[PDB]
């Protein structure tokens, strides 16, 4: 219910989806040909980060008003009251951001893929190997938006600077979330 019992509608979720994760990756071209060493290693590092991008719906930035899977609302403008870390608020910052973007499916996706594969190299073997794969998921997404947002340019590399924040985000607040199972 109240104060801090938030983390309940958030908590039941996203533990269930660290899987998602894993599949989602599957349909990424040429991760399974990564060492099974790093494409775990890198889900491991970056699953954290590709739910963040992802829960980015969850948050309507016009109601100020997040909707958690079993749809139940509350409010980024009252639960800063309500105790409610501050994480969730952390959270709301950069969600409307990235959702002013305007994606498209296929972008979205494409971002997140790219996500995915720009997590911490430090479990990494072969980053030599993980880099070309970032290089070349970094390619589709820089014409797909260049093609999508003609004049609309700048959402490309304000998706490269998502990137870090996204970086301290997980090294901020992970500790209390995927460690559910």
Do not use: C
């Not at 910052?93 to 499916?105: G, R, T």
């Amino acid at each position: 219910k109240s104060g801090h019992e938030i983390w309940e509608e958030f908590s039941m979720s996203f533990t269930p989806a660290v899987k998602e994760v894993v599949e989602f990756a599957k349909r990424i071209p040429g991760f399974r040909d990564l060492s099974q060493h790093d494409q775990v290693n890198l889900l491991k590092a970056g699953t954290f980060e590709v739910l963040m991008v992802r829960f980015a719906s969850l948050f309507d930035a016009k109601e100020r008003t997040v909707t958690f899977l079993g749809s139940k609302k509350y409010s980024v403008d009252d639960l800063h009251s309500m105790g409610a870390g501050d994480l969730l608020n952390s959270m709301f910052e950069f969600s409307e951001k990235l959702n002013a973007l305007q994606l498209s499916d296929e972008e979205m996706s494409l971002f997140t893929a790219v996500v995915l594969v720009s997590a911490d190299r430090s479990g990494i073997e072969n980053v030599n190997s993980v880099e070309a794969l970032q290089e070349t998921l970094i390619r589709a997404l820089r014409t797909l938006i260049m093609k999508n947002h003609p004049n609309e340019a700048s959402i490309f590399t304000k998706l490269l600077l998502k990137l870090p924040d996204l970086r301290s985000l997980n090294n901020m607040h992970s500790e209390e979330l995927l460690a559910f199972k």
